[model samples]
Target: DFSRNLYDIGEQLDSEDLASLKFLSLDYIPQRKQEPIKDALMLFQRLQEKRMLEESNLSFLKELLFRINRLDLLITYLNTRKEEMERELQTPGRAQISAYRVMLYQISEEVSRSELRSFKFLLQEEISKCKLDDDMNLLDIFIEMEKRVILGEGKLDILKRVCAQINKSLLKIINDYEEFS
Candidate 1:
């Protein structure tokens, strides 16, 4: 996949980015040290290879790209990998939507700009709607619960006790479901 987009990255990253690569913590990919990145494509290919690259590794590269002010490369990595994985799995994993969903939790975990984390409750309900859309088949409620401090009944105690297990109210809606890549 990286190989496919080498030319794209080639135009975005220059020798400085290449130099930064060598110093970054790519220990998960120790072999990259041995692989010379004479051309930009070579570096892209390195990330494409499964043995060398991982989801977290992609984050590291993205952070590096961001520091270098190469948001294009960051966007390129997200879109490129998402599309590539979709082609392989023929399903939602290609979009990395699930991972992005999880990312929402972390993002809202600390946002001083909001008085209340409306987005957090919104995301939780969005996922709940996805469960209904999928007929709750992929709900994975068995998935262990984390302390969703953000969504304590929207803190106004107004979300539901019905589905929370009582005679109350629950809103129903069609929601999108995206699997992990």
Candidate 2:
């Protein structure tokens, strides 16, 4: 029903918007599956293929726009106001972003470079030496940790240890999730 609205919204998205959508949608559409998508419309098509986007379910779309701070389009195209979307997400299992991803994102945003260096140093024995390179950001390091089986949905012991050593506040991020997850 909102296909027309989707088309218009797709056209409105700039490169930055597209990139944010791509990053946020990684939970639903992995990078390998999204390799060929170069625009918002193309991305939408892939979502449709996965049954992630449909006439009956626009939650994914709403969450995407909300994450990208595109409430204008969410309101105009979806006819759902900000408060409605906020209230809708309060229901269990209604959220699209996983708690694991939220934890990583929060750390990525809050971690300082020196704090990252400390975390990386602590990870020396846990992960490959080369994997903890200076250029590797928090998210990249988290991915490597996940691959090495040290970090995951319910397995965040190593992550909590690193956070505890460098910045105890970050532990609150993981602890908060423990309260829910």
lDDT of each: 0.38, 0.74
List model 2 lDDT by residue over 1-181, tens digit each. 5887778888887765676566667777877876688888889888899888877887888877766667888778888788666754577787786656656676776789888887777878557644555466677677667667777777876677778777878887777676464
Candidate 2: C-alpha RMSD to true structure equals: 3.3
> Which number leads on TM-score?
2
lDDT of 1 by residue, 31-84 (tens): 334256665556655656733344444543444454344666656655543223
RMSD of each: 14.5, 3.3
Mark the regions of model 2 whose C-alpha exceeds 4 Å error after superposition.
4-23, 113-125, 129-135
Using all chains and alpha carbons, the TM-scores for the candidates as numbered come to 0.32, 0.74
In terms of lDDT, which candidate is strongest? 2
What lDDT score goes with residue 14 in model 2? 72
Clashing pairs in 1: 86-94
